[PDB]
Design a protein around this nucleic acid. Sequence first.
RNA 1: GGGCCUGACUGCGAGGCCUGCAAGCCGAGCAGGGGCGAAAGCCGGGCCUAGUGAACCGGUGGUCCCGUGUGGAAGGGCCAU
RNA 2: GGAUGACCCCAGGCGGUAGGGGAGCGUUCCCGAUGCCGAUGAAGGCCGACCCGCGAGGGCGGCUGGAGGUAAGGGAAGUGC
RNA 3: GUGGAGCCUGGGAGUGAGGGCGCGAGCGAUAACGUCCGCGUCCGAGCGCGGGAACAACCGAGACCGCCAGCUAAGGCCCCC
RNA 4: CUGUUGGGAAGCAGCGCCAGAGAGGGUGAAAGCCCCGUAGGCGAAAGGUGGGGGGAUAGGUGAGGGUACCCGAGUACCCCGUGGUUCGUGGAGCCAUGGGGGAAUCUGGGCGGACCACCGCCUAAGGCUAAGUACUCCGGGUGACCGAUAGCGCACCAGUACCGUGAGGGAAAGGUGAAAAGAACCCCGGGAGGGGAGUGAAAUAGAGCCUGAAACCGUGGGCUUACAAGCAGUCACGGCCCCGAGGGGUUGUGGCGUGCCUAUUGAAGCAUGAGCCGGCGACUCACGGUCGUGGGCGAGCUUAAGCCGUUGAGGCGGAGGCGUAGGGAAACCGAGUCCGAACAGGGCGCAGCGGCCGCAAAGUCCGCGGCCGUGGACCCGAAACCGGGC
RNA 5: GGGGGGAACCUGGGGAACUGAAACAUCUCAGUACCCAGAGGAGAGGAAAGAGAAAUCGACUCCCUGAGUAGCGGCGAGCGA
Lengths: 202, 64, 116, 149
Amino acid sequence: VYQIPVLSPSGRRELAADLPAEINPHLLWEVVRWQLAKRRRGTASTKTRGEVAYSGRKIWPQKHTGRARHGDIGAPIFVGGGVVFGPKPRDYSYTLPKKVRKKGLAMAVADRAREGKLLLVEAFAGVNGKTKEFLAWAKEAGLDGSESVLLVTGNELVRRAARNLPWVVTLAPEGLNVYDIVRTERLVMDLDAWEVFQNRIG
Amino acid sequence: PKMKTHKGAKKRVKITASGKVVAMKTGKRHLNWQKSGKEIRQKGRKFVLAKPEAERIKLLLPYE
Amino acid sequence: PRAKTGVVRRRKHKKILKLAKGYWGLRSKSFRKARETLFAAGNYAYAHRKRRKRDFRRLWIVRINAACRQHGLNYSTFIHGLKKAGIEVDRKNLADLAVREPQVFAELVERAKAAQ
Amino acid sequence: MKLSDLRPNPGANKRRKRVGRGPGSGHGKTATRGHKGQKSRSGGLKDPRRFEGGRSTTLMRLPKRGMQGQVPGEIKRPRYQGVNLKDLARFEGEVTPELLVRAGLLKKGYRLKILGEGEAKPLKVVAHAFSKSALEKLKAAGGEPVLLE
RNA sequence: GGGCCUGACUGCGAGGCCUGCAAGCCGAGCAGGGGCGAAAGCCGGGCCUAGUGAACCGGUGGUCCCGUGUGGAAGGGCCAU
RNA sequence: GGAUGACCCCAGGCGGUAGGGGAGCGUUCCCGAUGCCGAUGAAGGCCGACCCGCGAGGGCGGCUGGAGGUAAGGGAAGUGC
RNA sequence: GUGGAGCCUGGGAGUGAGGGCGCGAGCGAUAACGUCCGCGUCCGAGCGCGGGAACAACCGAGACCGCCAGCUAAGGCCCCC
RNA sequence: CUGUUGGGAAGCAGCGCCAGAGAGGGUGAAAGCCCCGUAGGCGAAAGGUGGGGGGAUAGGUGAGGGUACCCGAGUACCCCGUGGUUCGUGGAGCCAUGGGGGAAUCUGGGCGGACCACCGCCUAAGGCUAAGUACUCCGGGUGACCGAUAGCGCACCAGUACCGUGAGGGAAAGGUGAAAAGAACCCCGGGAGGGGAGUGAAAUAGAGCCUGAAACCGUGGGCUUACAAGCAGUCACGGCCCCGAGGGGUUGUGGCGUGCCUAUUGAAGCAUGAGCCGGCGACUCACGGUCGUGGGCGAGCUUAAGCCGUUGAGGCGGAGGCGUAGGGAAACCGAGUCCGAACAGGGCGCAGCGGCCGCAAAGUCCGCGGCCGUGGACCCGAAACCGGGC
RNA sequence: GGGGGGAACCUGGGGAACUGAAACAUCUCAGUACCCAGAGGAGAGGAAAGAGAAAUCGACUCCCUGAGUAGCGGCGAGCGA
Ligand SMILES: NC(=[NH2+])NCCC[C@H](N)C(=O)O
Ligand SMILES: [Mg+2]
Ligand SMILES: [Mg+2]
Ligand SMILES: [Mg+2]
Ligand SMILES: [Mg+2]
Ligand SMILES: [Mg+2]
Ligand SMILES: [Mg+2]
Ligand SMILES: [Mg+2]
Ligand SMILES: [Mg+2]
Ligand SMILES: [Mg+2]
Ligand SMILES: [Mg+2]
Ligand SMILES: [Mg+2]
Ligand SMILES: [Mg+2]
Ligand SMILES: [Mg+2]
Ligand SMILES: [Mg+2]
Ligand SMILES: [Mg+2]
Ligand SMILES: [Mg+2]
Ligand SMILES: [Mg+2]
Ligand SMILES: [Mg+2]
Ligand SMILES: [Mg+2]
Ligand SMILES: [Mg+2]
Ligand SMILES: [Mg+2]
Ligand SMILES: [Mg+2]
Ligand SMILES: [Mg+2]
Ligand SMILES: [Mg+2]
Ligand SMILES: [Mg+2]
Ligand SMILES: [Mg+2]
Ligand SMILES: [Mg+2]
Ligand SMILES: [Mg+2]
Ligand SMILES: [Mg+2]
Ligand SMILES: [Mg+2]
Ligand SMILES: [Mg+2]
Ligand SMILES: [Mg+2]
Ligand SMILES: [Mg+2]
Ligand SMILES: [Mg+2]
Ligand SMILES: [Mg+2]
Ligand SMILES: [Mg+2]
Ligand SMILES: [Mg+2]
Ligand SMILES: [Mg+2]
Ligand SMILES: [Mg+2]
Ligand SMILES: [Mg+2]
Ligand SMILES: [Mg+2]
Ligand SMILES: [Mg+2]
Ligand SMILES: [Mg+2]
Ligand SMILES: [Mg+2]
Ligand SMILES: [Mg+2]
Ligand SMILES: [Mg+2]
Ligand SMILES: [Mg+2]
Ligand SMILES: [Mg+2]
Ligand SMILES: [Mg+2]
Ligand SMILES: [Mg+2]
Ligand SMILES: [Mg+2]
Ligand SMILES: [Mg+2]
Ligand SMILES: [Mg+2]
Ligand SMILES: [Mg+2]
Ligand SMILES: [Mg+2]
Ligand SMILES: [Mg+2]
Ligand SMILES: [Mg+2]
Ligand SMILES: [Mg+2]
Ligand SMILES: [Mg+2]
Ligand SMILES: [Mg+2]
Ligand SMILES: [Mg+2]
Ligand SMILES: [Mg+2]
Ligand SMILES: [Mg+2]
Ligand SMILES: [Mg+2]
Ligand SMILES: [Mg+2]
Ligand SMILES: [Mg+2]
Ligand SMILES: [Mg+2]
Ligand SMILES: [Mg+2]
Ligand SMILES: [Mg+2]
Ligand SMILES: [Mg+2]
Ligand SMILES: [Mg+2]
Ligand SMILES: [Mg+2]
Ligand SMILES: [Mg+2]
Ligand SMILES: [Mg+2]
Ligand SMILES: [Mg+2]
Ligand SMILES: [Mg+2]
Ligand SMILES: [Mg+2]
Ligand SMILES: [Mg+2]
Ligand SMILES: [Mg+2]
Ligand SMILES: [Mg+2]
Ligand SMILES: [Mg+2]
Ligand SMILES: [Mg+2]
Ligand SMILES: [Mg+2]
Ligand SMILES: [Mg+2]
Ligand SMILES: [Mg+2]
Ligand SMILES: [Mg+2]
Ligand SMILES: [Mg+2]
Ligand SMILES: [Mg+2]
Ligand SMILES: [Mg+2]
Ligand SMILES: [Mg+2]
Ligand SMILES: [Mg+2]
Ligand SMILES: [Mg+2]
Ligand SMILES: [Mg+2]
Ligand SMILES: [Mg+2]
Ligand SMILES: [Mg+2]
Ligand SMILES: [Mg+2]
Ligand SMILES: [Mg+2]
Ligand SMILES: [Mg+2]
Ligand SMILES: [Mg+2]
Ligand SMILES: [Mg+2]
Ligand SMILES: [Mg+2]
Ligand SMILES: [Mg+2]
Ligand SMILES: [Mg+2]
Ligand SMILES: [Mg+2]
Ligand SMILES: [Mg+2]
Ligand SMILES: [Mg+2]
Ligand SMILES: [Mg+2]
Ligand SMILES: [Mg+2]
Ligand SMILES: [Mg+2]
Ligand SMILES: [Mg+2]
Ligand SMILES: [Mg+2]
Ligand SMILES: [Mg+2]
Ligand SMILES: [Mg+2]
Ligand SMILES: [Mg+2]
Ligand SMILES: [Mg+2]
Ligand SMILES: [Mg+2]
Ligand SMILES: [Mg+2]
Ligand SMILES: [Mg+2]
Ligand SMILES: [Mg+2]
Ligand SMILES: [Mg+2]
Ligand SMILES: [Mg+2]
Ligand SMILES: [Mg+2]
Ligand SMILES: [Mg+2]
Ligand SMILES: [Mg+2]
Ligand SMILES: [Mg+2]
Ligand SMILES: [Mg+2]
Ligand SMILES: [Mg+2]
Ligand SMILES: [Mg+2]
Ligand SMILES: [Mg+2]
Ligand SMILES: [Mg+2]
Ligand SMILES: [Mg+2]
Ligand SMILES: [Mg+2]
Ligand SMILES: [Mg+2]
Ligand SMILES: [Mg+2]
Ligand SMILES: [Mg+2]
Ligand SMILES: [Mg+2]
Ligand SMILES: [Mg+2]
Ligand SMILES: [Mg+2]
Ligand SMILES: [Mg+2]
Ligand SMILES: [Mg+2]
Ligand SMILES: [Mg+2]
Ligand SMILES: [Mg+2]
Ligand SMILES: [Mg+2]
Ligand SMILES: [Mg+2]
Ligand SMILES: [Mg+2]
Ligand SMILES: [Mg+2]
Ligand SMILES: [Mg+2]
Ligand SMILES: [Mg+2]
Ligand SMILES: [Mg+2]
Ligand SMILES: [Mg+2]
Ligand SMILES: [Mg+2]
Ligand SMILES: [Mg+2]
Ligand SMILES: [Mg+2]
Ligand SMILES: [Mg+2]
Ligand SMILES: [Mg+2]
Ligand SMILES: [Mg+2]
Ligand SMILES: [Mg+2]
Ligand SMILES: [Mg+2]
Ligand SMILES: [Mg+2]
Ligand SMILES: [Mg+2]
Ligand SMILES: [Mg+2]
Ligand SMILES: [Mg+2]
Ligand SMILES: [Mg+2]
Ligand SMILES: [Mg+2]
Ligand SMILES: [Mg+2]
Ligand SMILES: [Mg+2]
Ligand SMILES: [Mg+2]
Ligand SMILES: [Mg+2]
Ligand SMILES: [Mg+2]
Ligand SMILES: [Mg+2]
Ligand SMILES: [Mg+2]
Ligand SMILES: [Mg+2]
Ligand SMILES: [Mg+2]
Ligand SMILES: [Mg+2]
Ligand SMILES: [Mg+2]
Ligand SMILES: [Mg+2]
Ligand SMILES: [Mg+2]
Ligand SMILES: [Mg+2]
Ligand SMILES: [Mg+2]
Ligand SMILES: [Mg+2]
Ligand SMILES: [Mg+2]
Ligand SMILES: [Mg+2]
Ligand SMILES: [Mg+2]
Ligand SMILES: [Mg+2]
Ligand SMILES: [Mg+2]
Ligand SMILES: [Mg+2]
Ligand SMILES: [Mg+2]
Ligand SMILES: [Mg+2]
Ligand SMILES: [Mg+2]
Ligand SMILES: [Mg+2]
Ligand SMILES: [Mg+2]
Ligand SMILES: [Mg+2]
Ligand SMILES: [Mg+2]
Ligand SMILES: [Mg+2]
Ligand SMILES: [Mg+2]
Ligand SMILES: [Mg+2]
Ligand SMILES: [Mg+2]
Ligand SMILES: [Mg+2]
Ligand SMILES: [Mg+2]
Ligand SMILES: [Mg+2]
Ligand SMILES: [Mg+2]
Ligand SMILES: [Mg+2]
Ligand SMILES: [Mg+2]
Ligand SMILES: [Mg+2]
Ligand SMILES: [Mg+2]
Ligand SMILES: [Mg+2]
Ligand SMILES: [Mg+2]
Ligand SMILES: [Mg+2]
Ligand SMILES: [Mg+2]
Ligand SMILES: [Mg+2]
Ligand SMILES: [Mg+2]
Ligand SMILES: [Mg+2]
Ligand SMILES: [Mg+2]
Ligand SMILES: [Mg+2]
Ligand SMILES: [Mg+2]
Ligand SMILES: [Mg+2]
Ligand SMILES: [Mg+2]
Ligand SMILES: [Mg+2]
Ligand SMILES: [Mg+2]
Ligand SMILES: [Mg+2]
Ligand SMILES: [Mg+2]
Ligand SMILES: [Mg+2]
Ligand SMILES: [Mg+2]
Ligand SMILES: [Mg+2]
Ligand SMILES: [Mg+2]
Ligand SMILES: [Mg+2]
Ligand SMILES: [Mg+2]
Ligand SMILES: [Mg+2]
Ligand SMILES: [Mg+2]
Ligand SMILES: [Mg+2]
Ligand SMILES: [Mg+2]
Ligand SMILES: [Mg+2]
Ligand SMILES: [Mg+2]
Ligand SMILES: [Mg+2]
Ligand SMILES: [Mg+2]
Ligand SMILES: [Mg+2]
Ligand SMILES: [Mg+2]
Ligand SMILES: [Mg+2]
Ligand SMILES: [Mg+2]
Ligand SMILES: [Mg+2]
Ligand SMILES: [Mg+2]
Ligand SMILES: [Mg+2]
Ligand SMILES: [Mg+2]
Ligand SMILES: [Mg+2]
Ligand SMILES: [Mg+2]
Ligand SMILES: [Mg+2]
Ligand SMILES: [Mg+2]
Ligand SMILES: [Mg+2]
Ligand SMILES: [Mg+2]
Ligand SMILES: [Mg+2]
Ligand SMILES: [Mg+2]
Ligand SMILES: [Mg+2]
Ligand SMILES: [Mg+2]
Ligand SMILES: [Mg+2]
Ligand SMILES: [Mg+2]
Ligand SMILES: [Mg+2]
Ligand SMILES: [Mg+2]
Ligand SMILES: [Mg+2]
Ligand SMILES: [Mg+2]
Ligand SMILES: [Mg+2]
Ligand SMILES: [Mg+2]
Ligand SMILES: [Mg+2]
Ligand SMILES: [Mg+2]
Ligand SMILES: [Mg+2]
Ligand SMILES: [Mg+2]
Ligand SMILES: [Mg+2]
Ligand SMILES: [Mg+2]
Ligand SMILES: [Mg+2]
Ligand SMILES: [Mg+2]
Ligand SMILES: [Mg+2]
Ligand SMILES: [Mg+2]
Ligand SMILES: [Mg+2]
Ligand SMILES: [Mg+2]
Ligand SMILES: [Mg+2]
Ligand SMILES: [Mg+2]
Ligand SMILES: [Mg+2]
Ligand SMILES: [Mg+2]
Ligand SMILES: [Mg+2]
Ligand SMILES: [Mg+2]
Ligand SMILES: [Mg+2]
Ligand SMILES: [Mg+2]
Ligand SMILES: [Mg+2]
Ligand SMILES: [Mg+2]
Ligand SMILES: [Mg+2]
Ligand SMILES: [Mg+2]
Ligand SMILES: [Mg+2]
Ligand SMILES: [Mg+2]
Ligand SMILES: [Mg+2]
Ligand SMILES: [Mg+2]
Ligand SMILES: [Mg+2]
Ligand SMILES: [Mg+2]
Ligand SMILES: [Mg+2]
Ligand SMILES: [Mg+2]
Ligand SMILES: [Mg+2]
Ligand SMILES: [Mg+2]
Ligand SMILES: [Mg+2]
Ligand SMILES: [Mg+2]
Ligand SMILES: [Mg+2]
Ligand SMILES: [Mg+2]
Ligand SMILES: [Mg+2]
Ligand SMILES: [Mg+2]
Ligand SMILES: [Mg+2]
Ligand SMILES: [Mg+2]
Ligand SMILES: [Mg+2]
Ligand SMILES: [Mg+2]
Ligand SMILES: [Mg+2]
Ligand SMILES: [Mg+2]
Ligand SMILES: [Mg+2]
Ligand SMILES: [Mg+2]
């Protein structure tokens, strides 16, 4: 139902593949929210009035001094006291449904396919590790760097060559994720990475 | 931490399939000699707790 | 993250103190006394723009009354005469006429005496 | 579609209720708590599900009934889960406890008992028990009741 | 006032009164086995409204429902008090 | 009405404590951002009789300041005295 | 009788110190700005507006905003007004 | 690299280049290529480590048949007093043992929740034993962590000053500038301080130094005020001053007018709190629950700890949980079941829109929101109680 | 060979109370706080006189789950394999 342009030495073929016809924006939103929440460090912390360094002594008598009543100086009403309901170390991760994740993956690739921004390649002609080599290959492939590109391939030498380009994000196929797809204006995958993708949304 | 089941409710009461709360009639534990057979008999049945009280008791049985 | 007060309260206080320019003593200098003064000020302005409509009608009526009594009738009989004559010039314009155009007001008095 | 287009559906992410933040909110000062009770205090009331202000509670005035058990506790005995004929309509050939556990019908650690809601089909069904009507239907439909032990 | 009697029933209970809850109250009718009456019928205590006490804990009679590997037993449950 | 929050027309409601509900403003931080605004001057400060907004606010202009700030759209809270 | 009517299910409450007045009673002394019920009302929450010299609850009247326009309500029309 | 504006280029402009390096921090402003780094690599004579590799050594090793010699003693075991366990005397077993009594060596003994029988499990009264687990004084890495009232009590000569006999208590206090170029010299002054000169892009950046709010205190100017009754304003008109059919400032007279908050039936109230200003200051979080809601899937839905990957990449993992059947104290039966003699009566149960595909739905998962339970649970506040010390 | 020290962590020997039960004594807080002895980079535990019903498993430790289940409980509050 989608016609996906392939890049071959023999020429621009066409591979067909069924991806979700319907894009559900809210669902992709839920996946990105999950991805961004689970990476949070959760390292904000404060000190309660029990965790603060001061003595528990009552600073002056309850009655007859003419001052307001007080207990110890760690109470949160004091400058330098403990803090009320401050943050504590916290785990923001949660288990988004696997079927939502997998469906989000497929929709994210579908969205690029429907825009014409998904390109598959058999091989990276002569890119062997050097950024200049990938730049030449990119130009011939139509990747002039005017659009950000998510490059998914299991070829290490291709990833090492592209990764320092400001407009390229590089992933191995087992790391395809919808936040990285939506981050970038174009999707560029190995036929090998494509099959890993197809195995995962199956 | 997770709620604990209230065991006094669990020993007195049942939640039915449709979420009613059923208990035993009171009043025949003792002092029965002069109670009519009608009173003894009808006190041998279960009854449905009034809605306000049934809602509270069901909150005490979070895992039934 | 922490969100300390920062600039927010200073700016709210300056809005209020600016509205209170001209007030006496701390009523223009203290944020607290200025706010209290403005509470009253806002109620007064509301109450007084209602009241201004009555203040002016009272003034018109008094001036109309004196104009009438130069022609030998009082305000109440004058107004009744205008109602029977079907004349609907309001009290704001009648009082202007009584001062700025005495020949027209004299005519209006005529119509009113004659309408009874 | 790009990052600035990612949006929750309307109503998906609602704002919270923030009390004690000024007169305009509707929730200032007393913070929707009213004036001056035990319920207004930090710490609040006794458990509203049970406590009734000192009188003997609704629950405690009701009588206990039944066996509640004793130490050393629950007597191990074989337990049965019933599975209706209707739930067997998707199987072909032979159905057995392990198959119904896999399909999400029977729970592990439960002997299988077939029950008679629905219609039988000609299947060889292996189980630890059968309702009287489930035997009747399964025989009439050409099935093979195989009783286990 | 007299005769014969034990319905001062067992298993239930349509429908209501009252009512915050829990209680309290009235109840035709069906079945079992009866009492009185020739019968129609009446009888599930008392002309009526007070004579009373929720749970928990325990006793007694029955039931034979549970019985910690098994058969028993201990100890419980249920019905009645 | 027109088809849908496109704007219009007609009609009606619109005092308010405890309290229920709705819609917004602003503060700190994250994505947006290897971007973009910035010494031809960031943030903050001091003015304004100007503009927008019912309002909380947001612009714009002059002065100060001298190096940071951060959009549409979303996310999270040590969020408004 | 189409009303910010009613009924059903469910989420969230707050309130469980009332007070004046009119009428009907009890208590009190055919006392209390007294006290305790009933029907109603207002204040509470309308200490917003007119009248009552001033004054929560007496009379008039239910304040969405603006007007240097008009009609009335109670109460007033010798001067303060 | 060059030009250009600027005190200064890294900004803007022209033409280039590197990249397994475009993480980040500096440099006079905003730099991939100036500097320190980063990617990728390299490195120990000496001391420490060495759970990995190699090598030693210690130690490890049969079958019948007979014999009945040994197999952990004040022990088992029973009773009494207790502890441990979910078990609070309970039908109270098990494990431990302070007191009393007190065995046996496999045909011995302990256990399977009183006890007895049967059937099984196990070998007490000697000792040792890596790893998986806990913690963070110490080192490093990383933050939808703080940014000088915050963050540790301490960014600074802080467990200091100071308080206390003592245990013990316990602060405040960061910033010139790009560079000290930290102002020679002259002038008034005893000095302090200042005025010139001079430095600087800038000196109300001059060391009592970035920015420099507010209360509070002055100097100058406009309007105004000594016959006037006031919660201090507000409405109106007029005068004067200012900026140019308008507006800003001021206020003479006239009208009206009982501060704010709290608590109350009721407060301007002669009821509470507040001298004023600035800053800190109170409804949260985890887990569970119950509704509502945005999505996923649907007779199913979903994983947990982990494991693999990544180094802000996700995947695997079905153990388990909820749901798919209820009724009954239970045996048990089951779209029924319980009470009952009942085939009676009653209680509790039981049940899609469309032209096969849609849809819509049990239910369940995740996000979000309200409220509930457990925790200090909105914040501050006792008098007290207890432990260990002084 | 020992002695003394070490932020927490660990084991053993002793061991509270406020509080909760809307009073309080059993019960709770809790074998927690704290005192003490000892240990080490860990400590404890550990190779069945085990479990408990599987004709079964096979040291110990630690995580998930079983499960707020079984049960315990002035059968209260709660406690909890
Ligand atoms: N092939 C990969 N796994 N690439 C990950 C990218 C790592 C790093 N963030 C970079 O941009 O270079
Ligand atoms: Mg975080
Ligand atoms: Mg955090
Ligand atoms: Mg902290
Ligand atoms: Mg803190
Ligand atoms: Mg404290
Ligand atoms: Mg403390
Ligand atoms: Mg402390
Ligand atoms: Mg200290
Ligand atoms: Mg301390
Ligand atoms: Mg203390
Ligand atoms: Mg204290
Ligand atoms: Mg102390
Ligand atoms: Mg103390
Ligand atoms: Mg005092
Ligand atoms: Mg004082
Ligand atoms: Mg004080
Ligand atoms: Mg004081
Ligand atoms: Mg005090
Ligand atoms: Mg204190
Ligand atoms: Mg303290
Ligand atoms: Mg401090
Ligand atoms: Mg301090
Ligand atoms: Mg602090
Ligand atoms: Mg705080
Ligand atoms: Mg707190
Ligand atoms: Mg606190
Ligand atoms: Mg964490
Ligand atoms: Mg959450
Ligand atoms: Mg998690
Ligand atoms: Mg990068
Ligand atoms: Mg890159
Ligand atoms: Mg990018
Ligand atoms: Mg990247
Ligand atoms: Mg109980
Ligand atoms: Mg009873
Ligand atoms: Mg009783
Ligand atoms: Mg009984
Ligand atoms: Mg009994
Ligand atoms: Mg009787
Ligand atoms: Mg009877
Ligand atoms: Mg009887
Ligand atoms: Mg009976
Ligand atoms: Mg469960
Ligand atoms: Mg259930
Ligand atoms: Mg604040
Ligand atoms: Mg601040
Ligand atoms: Mg401020
Ligand atoms: Mg403010
Ligand atoms: Mg400001
Ligand atoms: Mg402001
Ligand atoms: Mg003035
Ligand atoms: Mg002043
Ligand atoms: Mg003054
Ligand atoms: Mg001032
Ligand atoms: Mg105002
Ligand atoms: Mg007005
Ligand atoms: Mg008015
Ligand atoms: Mg006359
Ligand atoms: Mg008229
Ligand atoms: Mg007229
Ligand atoms: Mg939120
Ligand atoms: Mg919340
Ligand atoms: Mg809201
Ligand atoms: Mg808010
Ligand atoms: Mg507000
Ligand atoms: Mg609200
Ligand atoms: Mg309100
Ligand atoms: Mg307040
Ligand atoms: Mg509320
Ligand atoms: Mg609320
Ligand atoms: Mg509330
Ligand atoms: Mg309150
Ligand atoms: Mg009150
Ligand atoms: Mg109240
Ligand atoms: Mg209060
Ligand atoms: Mg109170
Ligand atoms: Mg009260
Ligand atoms: Mg209350
Ligand atoms: Mg309160
Ligand atoms: Mg309080
Ligand atoms: Mg408190
Ligand atoms: Mg309390
Ligand atoms: Mg009582
Ligand atoms: Mg049970
Ligand atoms: Mg056991
Ligand atoms: Mg067959
Ligand atoms: Mg007779
Ligand atoms: Mg007789
Ligand atoms: Mg006879
Ligand atoms: Mg009935
Ligand atoms: Mg009733
Ligand atoms: Mg009665
Ligand atoms: Mg009969
Ligand atoms: Mg008969
Ligand atoms: Mg008969
Ligand atoms: Mg006969
Ligand atoms: Mg008969
Ligand atoms: Mg009868
Ligand atoms: Mg009688
Ligand atoms: Mg009689
Ligand atoms: Mg009687
Ligand atoms: Mg009775
Ligand atoms: Mg009791
Ligand atoms: Mg009993
Ligand atoms: Mg018995
Ligand atoms: Mg039996
Ligand atoms: Mg046994
Ligand atoms: Mg047995
Ligand atoms: Mg036998
Ligand atoms: Mg048997
Ligand atoms: Mg026997
Ligand atoms: Mg028995
Ligand atoms: Mg009975
Ligand atoms: Mg309209
Ligand atoms: Mg309207
Ligand atoms: Mg309103
Ligand atoms: Mg609404
Ligand atoms: Mg906002
Ligand atoms: Mg704000
Ligand atoms: Mg941050
Ligand atoms: Mg960025
Ligand atoms: Mg930036
Ligand atoms: Mg620019
Ligand atoms: Mg410049
Ligand atoms: Mg400037
Ligand atoms: Mg800003
Ligand atoms: Mg900022
Ligand atoms: Mg502004
Ligand atoms: Mg400047
Ligand atoms: Mg500025
Ligand atoms: Mg910078
Ligand atoms: Mg931003
Ligand atoms: Mg987004
Ligand atoms: Mg956060
Ligand atoms: Mg706060
Ligand atoms: Mg209404
Ligand atoms: Mg209503
Ligand atoms: Mg309606
Ligand atoms: Mg409701
Ligand atoms: Mg609600
Ligand atoms: Mg709510
Ligand atoms: Mg209340
Ligand atoms: Mg309440
Ligand atoms: Mg009360
Ligand atoms: Mg009352
Ligand atoms: Mg009262
Ligand atoms: Mg009353
Ligand atoms: Mg009263
Ligand atoms: Mg009255
Ligand atoms: Mg009355
Ligand atoms: Mg009258
Ligand atoms: Mg009268
Ligand atoms: Mg009366
Ligand atoms: Mg009466
Ligand atoms: Mg008299
Ligand atoms: Mg009274
Ligand atoms: Mg009276
Ligand atoms: Mg009276
Ligand atoms: Mg009344
Ligand atoms: Mg009130
Ligand atoms: Mg009124
Ligand atoms: Mg009202
Ligand atoms: Mg009034
Ligand atoms: Mg009033
Ligand atoms: Mg008035
Ligand atoms: Mg009045
Ligand atoms: Mg008046
Ligand atoms: Mg008057
Ligand atoms: Mg009055
Ligand atoms: Mg009064
Ligand atoms: Mg109205
Ligand atoms: Mg008129
Ligand atoms: Mg009149
Ligand atoms: Mg008069
Ligand atoms: Mg007059
Ligand atoms: Mg130059
Ligand atoms: Mg240059
Ligand atoms: Mg350039
Ligand atoms: Mg990098
Ligand atoms: Mg960088
Ligand atoms: Mg850098
Ligand atoms: Mg730049
Ligand atoms: Mg920048
Ligand atoms: Mg750089
Ligand atoms: Mg490296
Ligand atoms: Mg390196
Ligand atoms: Mg041998
Ligand atoms: Mg021997
Ligand atoms: Mg041995
Ligand atoms: Mg020995
Ligand atoms: Mg013993
Ligand atoms: Mg014991
Ligand atoms: Mg014990
Ligand atoms: Mg017991
Ligand atoms: Mg025991
Ligand atoms: Mg034994
Ligand atoms: Mg012993
Ligand atoms: Mg023993
Ligand atoms: Mg043996
Ligand atoms: Mg033996
Ligand atoms: Mg033993
Ligand atoms: Mg024994
Ligand atoms: Mg055993
Ligand atoms: Mg090892
Ligand atoms: Mg070890
Ligand atoms: Mg270890
Ligand atoms: Mg560690
Ligand atoms: Mg560290
Ligand atoms: Mg910050
Ligand atoms: Mg920062
Ligand atoms: Mg500081
Ligand atoms: Mg500090
Ligand atoms: Mg500062
Ligand atoms: Mg601190
Ligand atoms: Mg430090
Ligand atoms: Mg110092
Ligand atoms: Mg001393
Ligand atoms: Mg000293
Ligand atoms: Mg001290
Ligand atoms: Mg300090
Ligand atoms: Mg500096
Ligand atoms: Mg410096
Ligand atoms: Mg500079
Ligand atoms: Mg001199
Ligand atoms: Mg001299
Ligand atoms: Mg000098
Ligand atoms: Mg000088
Ligand atoms: Mg000088
Ligand atoms: Mg110069
Ligand atoms: Mg310059
Ligand atoms: Mg300056
Ligand atoms: Mg400066
Ligand atoms: Mg600076
Ligand atoms: Mg300065
Ligand atoms: Mg200064
Ligand atoms: Mg100043
Ligand atoms: Mg002056
Ligand atoms: Mg005079
Ligand atoms: Mg004068
Ligand atoms: Mg005036
Ligand atoms: Mg006027
Ligand atoms: Mg003017
Ligand atoms: Mg003026
Ligand atoms: Mg004027
Ligand atoms: Mg006038
Ligand atoms: Mg006043
Ligand atoms: Mg008043
Ligand atoms: Mg105020
Ligand atoms: Mg107050
Ligand atoms: Mg008070
Ligand atoms: Mg009072
Ligand atoms: Mg009072
Ligand atoms: Mg006053
Ligand atoms: Mg006063
Ligand atoms: Mg007083
Ligand atoms: Mg006062
Ligand atoms: Mg008071
Ligand atoms: Mg003072
Ligand atoms: Mg002041
Ligand atoms: Mg302040
Ligand atoms: Mg909340
Ligand atoms: Mg929190
Ligand atoms: Mg939470
Ligand atoms: Mg939750
Ligand atoms: Mg929730
Ligand atoms: Mg949900
Ligand atoms: Mg799903
Ligand atoms: Mg799954
Ligand atoms: Mg579970
Ligand atoms: Mg059951
Ligand atoms: Mg039976
Ligand atoms: Mg039935
Ligand atoms: Mg039914
Ligand atoms: Mg669906
Ligand atoms: Mg759903
Ligand atoms: Mg709730
Ligand atoms: Mg707590
Ligand atoms: Mg606390
Ligand atoms: Mg709390
Ligand atoms: Mg809470
Ligand atoms: Mg004392
Ligand atoms: Mg005590
Ligand atoms: Mg005591
Ligand atoms: Mg002591
Ligand atoms: Mg020693
Ligand atoms: Mg020692
Ligand atoms: Mg040592
Ligand atoms: Mg111990
Ligand atoms: Mg010892
Ligand atoms: Mg001990
Ligand atoms: Mg210990
Ligand atoms: Mg002791
Ligand atoms: Mg105690
Ligand atoms: Mg406590
Ligand atoms: Mg507690
Ligand atoms: Mg409690
Ligand atoms: Mg207590
Ligand atoms: Mg209490
Ligand atoms: Mg007490
Ligand atoms: Mg106690
Ligand atoms: Mg304990
Ligand atoms: Mg401790
Ligand atoms: Mg030691
Ligand atoms: Mg280790
Ligand atoms: Mg060891
Ligand atoms: Mg050992
Ligand atoms: Mg051994
Ligand atoms: Mg389970
Ligand atoms: Mg315990």
